[PDB]
Amino acid sequence: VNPCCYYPCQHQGICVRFGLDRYQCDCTRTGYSGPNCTIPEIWTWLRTTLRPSPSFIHFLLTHGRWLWDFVNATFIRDTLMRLVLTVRSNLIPSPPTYNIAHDYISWESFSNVSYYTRILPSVPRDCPTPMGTKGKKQLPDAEFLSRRFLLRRKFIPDPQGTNLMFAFFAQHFTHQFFKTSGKMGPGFTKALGHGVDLGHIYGDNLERQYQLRLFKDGKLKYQMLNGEVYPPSVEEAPVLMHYPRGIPPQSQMAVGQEVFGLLPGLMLYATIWLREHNRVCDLLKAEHPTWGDEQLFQTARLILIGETIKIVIEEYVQQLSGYFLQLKFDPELLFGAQFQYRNRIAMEFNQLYHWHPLMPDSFRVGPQDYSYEQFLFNTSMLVDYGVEALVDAFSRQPAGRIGGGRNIDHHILHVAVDVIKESRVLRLQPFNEYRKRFGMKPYTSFQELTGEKEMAAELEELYGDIDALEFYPGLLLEKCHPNSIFGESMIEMGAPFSLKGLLGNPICSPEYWKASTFGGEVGFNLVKTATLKKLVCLNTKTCPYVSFHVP
Amino acid sequence: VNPCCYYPCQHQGICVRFGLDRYQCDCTRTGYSGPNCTIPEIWTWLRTTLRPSPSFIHFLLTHGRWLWDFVNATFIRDTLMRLVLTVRSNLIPSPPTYNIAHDYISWESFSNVSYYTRILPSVPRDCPTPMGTKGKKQLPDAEFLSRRFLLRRKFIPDPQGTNLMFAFFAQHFTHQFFKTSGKMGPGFTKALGHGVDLGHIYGDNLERQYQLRLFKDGKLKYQMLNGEVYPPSVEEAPVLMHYPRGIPPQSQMAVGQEVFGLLPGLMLYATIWLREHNRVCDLLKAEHPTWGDEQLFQTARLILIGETIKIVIEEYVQQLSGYFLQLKFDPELLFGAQFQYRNRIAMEFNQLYHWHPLMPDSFRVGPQDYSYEQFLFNTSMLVDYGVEALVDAFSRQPAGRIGGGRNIDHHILHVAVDVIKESRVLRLQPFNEYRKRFGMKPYTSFQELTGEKEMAAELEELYGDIDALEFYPGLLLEKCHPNSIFGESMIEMGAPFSLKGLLGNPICSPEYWKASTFGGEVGFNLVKTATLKKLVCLNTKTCPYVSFHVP
Ligand code: HEM
Ligand code: HEM
Ligand SMILES: *[C@@H]1O[C@H](CO)[C@@H](O[C@@H]2O[C@H](CO)[C@@H](O)[C@H](O)[C@H]2NC(C)=O)[C@H](O)[C@H]1NC(C)=O
Ligand SMILES: *[C@@H]1O[C@H](CO)[C@@H](O[C@@H]2O[C@H](CO)[C@@H](O)[C@H](O)[C@H]2NC(C)=O)[C@H](O)[C@H]1NC(C)=O
Ligand SMILES: COc1ccc2c(c1)c(CC(=O)O)c(C)n2C(=O)c1ccc(I)cc1
Ligand SMILES: COc1ccc2c(c1)c(CC(=O)O)c(C)n2C(=O)c1ccc(I)cc1
Ligand SMILES: *[C@@H]1O[C@H](CO)[C@@H](O)[C@H](O)[C@H]1NC(C)=O
Ligand SMILES: *[C@@H]1O[C@H](CO)[C@@H](O)[C@H](O)[C@H]1NC(C)=O
Ligand SMILES: *[C@@H]1O[C@H](CO)[C@@H](O)[C@H](O)[C@H]1NC(C)=O
Ligand SMILES: *[C@@H]1O[C@H](CO)[C@@H](O)[C@H](O)[C@H]1NC(C)=O
Does residue A32 sit in the same domain as residue A56? Predict the structure, then answer.
């Protein structure tokens, strides 16, 4: 049997096969020696024997508001954050390593950008069981597993105060670096860019950007409806969109991310940003009468990536954490560090991120309470209500907890079924292996993963071994931290990928982080002071309650 | 007039335009302050007031063989080299900055890999003269300039001992990262990869690699002629090659770099490497009976990139330098440094590298002395003579000096004409600006550039200003160092680009520099001990005189 199915090599050592029955662990620079990379170095030993658990830290960071307030006002705020940035990032390899096709380093992996990368090679196709050595020869029926432990029975709202404004923000921003090529199969992405390139606004390819572009003042095309600015129609900007058969071009808004037409929340955010891009164009032209379309356009886009990167950080990543420590977005905290300004979307990440539980049972817009069947392909709700109305609405309605179990609405429960299935095609390694990869202790029993006995008992008879518990389920069934939206794994695997992904954009490099990159101090400050409220309000007649937190 | 035409901003500060008549220099992190980035910081001041000229250093490194011998045996060899690596590299920006289309940072520049990048933005299209502010409104006729100062009158052999073996090696290796898209125009490359990806062996695209591949044991296809292994025929591997009309497929060797069929030297090296790739496949399979085609193939290619990177360094870059200091290729000297494992071929580099003077007057193969007209599209010379014969020949025949003037053979003198012309389309800045970019003092007169009065006097009446002397001519007409192949500029602009280009390949990163990346200690050592002699000799029945130095 393939010796590597035993996952012999610890601490990131690489299991290389040799001969017909041998294997060797490459423990290069792992901090351990030995046949399985298990004997630590004196420093490695200390470093780990002194690492306070995730739980202990997430305690501190969510406690002592008073003590934090002070720290937040001292330099220690940068000091910490920096550490977060560095430490958090080491967990993610760069340049990238494996892909659906190669469980080894290779020029093709490194250069063929159509593949999502992956942190742990697949479960060798020649192992006894699907997960390697443990568990059953057959894995739990995805469908069943989904109805038993993920089907929302009673809506559990997210304790932290997260609302649909954040929910939809989550979706939007993620679908700019998550874009699986249905034509190529799992493992393949259409979002070459692998990151915050804002391609969900400008298009994932030149042709499409040129379609969406006004080619005047750096402006993006658009249309006026009710005296308000909205994305142009597919008639004006003949771009490919995914609208159900039967809808005319004149009723479809062209936007960049073909999929965005199937949900007002999505098309709401697409409108705020289009508005914002054209707004910045004006600020620029005023300053640089000499510039042309391209430069106004290119510089506009760099300012928006910056805006996006900031909010995504100080307002978006702040909400999730639950932390008191003011997360600062400052590319300079990394200038002294050894960091690689490069990123590549991992498949392990496309899954981890699949937060479908967040969606509510119905969508309340004032006295009106719309059903999924009334929300889903509603070409009229946005123009009808207008930005402000929806922004206030989503900002007020709570979104559901993400971790815990049984909280995904039946309407989209199929998506979770597909996720689990794709996971298997991708041949992802077991959840417990992931725990270790990201520096955590693997679970010893189902009752420790879930904080109980009922589900644990059944997961046990389904999986057989805790060491056979799959990634996604293990991510959504594990116990939540105190009054959290989710827990440990999500937060200890989910952050690295999600931080290295941001601070690794080329604009955060010393080479690009210059006022001139943004057209001068004005563009630069736009970036430096971006904010959710400013983003909405500077682009709307009135300024509604706008937050990632429910009032 | 465009204020930026005056190249106002010093020390890499960025000239941003404002209003109709203003401009601002972005001196961010330049080490200088002031409206033009001219007032240094105390440290910057010291750092430069104490920098011994290029000339003084190139003196030391080419002198004191005895003192060097010792140093070379101490740790100081690494110590220095490391410094070379770091220092040399800072000169080159990463991530990349401008391109033919954008004289500003931009997402498109950063992501559209079809463009060659450039270190200095173009000469604004709205400047008084072609070079900005100085010189004449009309530039010297390329053709004339070429016949007057570059046309080889009497063959000047390269003083250092460089031979055609090195010459052809130079060509081969460079045409893997220099591959201008004739269909797209100047500024565009077909070599996405921008570096040592060995695509001149495997193809610049998947389709073509699959054509060249045996799909057995990781082997590359091939054919036996005279009991010897040679690249397959276009009949066997239906791949696109550039052979003159009238030559049948059965007489064309398919190789990866379409252009390689027009010169035995080129097809000589293509044969040595094909041989080498298949040789390593065997070493691998033996070790890993369990592996398949892909993995043998992928791992083979990583071993060859490594081989290539080493020889290119310790034998190739050693020859050019002329240095006594043993250049060590060790990716680890950089593990402590802040380095970006990323590269992008600059247009400024495609030019700089255009060493056509190297080609001799005739090609001597034993008693036989072939003319260009007998060498150029000679489909039979390689199979006729075989690897060894040619390798001995080229290793024995000296190549001509590269710097100095009037040493390019008439047969290819057109290429220099085109270079100068392309330079102008690309709107490259003046040579003197380049001097400064790469930390050198700009020339004050033509007589200082050339080491004399005759050519200097005429270049002067042609250009008008030394500050209008173009890049390429300035690179090939400047005075050579003592008994050198070329001088200062070439060596102070030509190395950075050429070092950062190597040490920046992903395999040099801590992430990939592991014995497992190469299939174990065996592949790893193959890399670690690669050598020109081993490369040829382990792939030939007999081992001829093989060197980059003439006997
Ligand atoms: C109205 C509620 C929502 C619906 C209708 C929905 C539906 C879907 C569907 C259809 C898939 C693709 C897999 C398949 O079923 O074939 C998917 C993928 C995705 N969704 Fe949602 N989703 C919703 C909200 C969100 C939210 C709030 C997030 C959080 C960011 C999210 C994250 C994802 C991710 C990460 C993907 C993977 C993208 C890719 O594979 O390219 N979705 N969603
Ligand atoms: C038999 C002698 C040689 C011939 C026939 C030759 C010819 C050419 C020609 C035709 C061009 C393209 C520009 C044009 O004229 O349209 C060129 C480009 C090139 N050659 Fe050579 N060359 C020779 C040797 C070499 C050598 C020894 C080097 C040194 C590496 C070299 C370096 C270059 C470079 C850098 C390019 C640019 C590649 C690109 O634009 O994609 N060539 N050469
Ligand atoms: C990136 O890798 C994918 C997968 O190898 C390549 O796609 C396949 O390429 C081969 C040869 O062109 C075809 O036979 C397959 O049908 C292709 N598609 C799929 C979905 O496998 C793709 O060509 C590579 N892209 C680049 C730019 O190298
Ligand atoms: C990279 O940039 C080049 C130049 O912009 C793009 O090529 C041009 O693209 C437009 C739109 O497709 C065409 O009208 C031109 O004819 C294209 N060719 C040239 C030579 O200009 C190219 O499409 C870009 N590539 C990517 C992958 O973005
Ligand atoms: C320390 O608490 C947290 C909590 C959440 C955090 C982080 C830290 C960090 C980094 C940091 O700021 O620590 C990021 C990137 N997070 C995310 O937003 C995230 C993204 C995707 C997924 I799925 C899960 C979480
Ligand atoms: C110090 O002397 C030298 C002389 C030549 C050197 C170098 C150093 C370095 C780096 C280093 O080893 O210093 C490289 C990369 N060189 C080149 O081979 C080179 C490449 C292209 C061109 I056009 C010109 C030179
Ligand atoms: C290495 O791991 C294998 C597989 O778990 C195990 O059988 C072997 O005993 C281990 N060797 C050591 C020294 O831990
Ligand atoms: C779309 O939303 C509007 C509210 O703006 C509602 O009146 C309309 O009925 C919805 N359309 C569908 C098909 O549910
Ligand atoms: C800046 O450079 C411009 C153009 O060379 C020059 O006219 C001006 O005097 C300079 N200003 C200073 C303070 O050097
Ligand atoms: C090609 O080279 C051979 C020497 O191997 C020579 O005899 C032959 O004439 C050459 N062909 C041409 C067309 O010059």
Answer: no
Residue of B nearest to A15 (CA): B516
Report, in angstroms and rounded to the nearest whole number, the Rg of chain A calculated over CA atoms.
24
Q: Which residue of B has its CA nearest to A199?
A: B107
Q: According to the entry, how was the structure determined? A: X-ray
Q: Distance (Å, rounded) from C-alpha B155 to C-alpha B401?
A: 9
Look at the block and give the residue holding tokens 């057989």. A464
SS (H, E, C) A392-444: HHHHHCECECCCCCCCECHHHHHHHHHHHHHHHHCCCCCHHHHHHHCCCCCCC
**Beta carbons of B291 and A105 less than 8 Å apart:** no
Q: Report the domain count for chain B.
A: 2
Rounded Cα distance, B344 and B92, in Å: 10
For tokens 């493992």, the residue is A187
Task: Kindly state whether residues B327 and B446 are assigned to the same domain.
Answer: yes
Question: Which residue in the list A116, A316, A353, A472 is annotated as catalytic?
Answer: A353
For residues B438 and B451, is the Cβ–Cβ distance under 8 A?
Answer: no
B315 and B421, same domain (yes or no): yes
Q: Computed from CA positions of residues A337, A342, A347, A352, in that sequence, does the dihedral angle turn out positive or negative? A: positive
Clarify whether residues A33 and A57 are in a common domain. Answer: no
Cα–Cα distance measured from residue B176 to residue A230, given in angstroms and rounded to the nearest whole number: 47
- The SS3 call for residue B471 is helix
Q: Among the bound ligands, name the one nearest to the CA of residue A259.
A: 1
Which of A226, A368, A371, A384 has most ligand 8 atoms within 8 Å of CB, for mutation? A384
Query: Are the beta carbons of B334 and B85 closer than 8 angstroms?
Result: yes
Using CA atoms, how far apart are residues B195 and B173, in angstroms rounded to an integer?
A: 10
Q: CB under 8 Å to B265, separation ≥6 — which residues?
A: B164, B167, B168, B171, B172, B390, B394
Question: Are B458 and B452 in contact, with CB atoms under 8 Å apart?
Answer: no
Residue having the nearest C-alpha atom to atom 10 of ligand 8:
A374
Crossing angle of helices A381-396 and A164-174, rounded to 10°: 120
Instruction: Based on the residue annotation, tell me whether A353 is a catalytic residue of this protein.
Output: yes
Amino acid identity, residue B319?
Q
Q: For residue B430, count CB atoms less than 10 angstroms from its CB and return exposed for 0-12, middle for 13-18, buried for 19 or more.
A: buried
User: Are A106 and B299 within 8 A, CB to CB?
Assistant: yes
CB spacing of B290 vs A19 below 8 angstroms? yes
How close B114 gets to chain A, by Cα (Å)?
12
Q: Collect all residues of chain B within an 8 Å Cβ-Cβ radius of residue A198.
A: 107
Q: Do both A161 and A293 map to the same domain?
A: yes
How far apart are the C-alpha atoms of A308 and A320, rounded to whole Å?
A: 16
Are both A270 and A143 inside the same structural domain?
A: yes
Give which of A465, A448, A447, A464 is closest to A456, Cα–Cα: A447
- What's chain B's Rg over C-alpha atoms? 24
B379 to chain A nearest CA, in Å? Answer: 32
State if residue A36 touches ligand 7 by the CB under 6 angstroms criterion. yes
Q: Within this chain, do residues B215 and B272 fall inside the same structural domain, yes or no?
A: yes
Question: Which residue's alpha carbon is nearest to atom 22 within ligand 1?
Answer: A356
CATH of the domain at B3: 2.10.25.10
B4 and B81 share one domain? no
The parent domain of residue B5 ranges over 1-41
Cβ–Cβ under 8 Å, residues A299 and A524? no
Q: Which resolution, in Å, applies to this structure?
A: 4.5
Output the domain CATH number for residue B202.
1.10.640.10
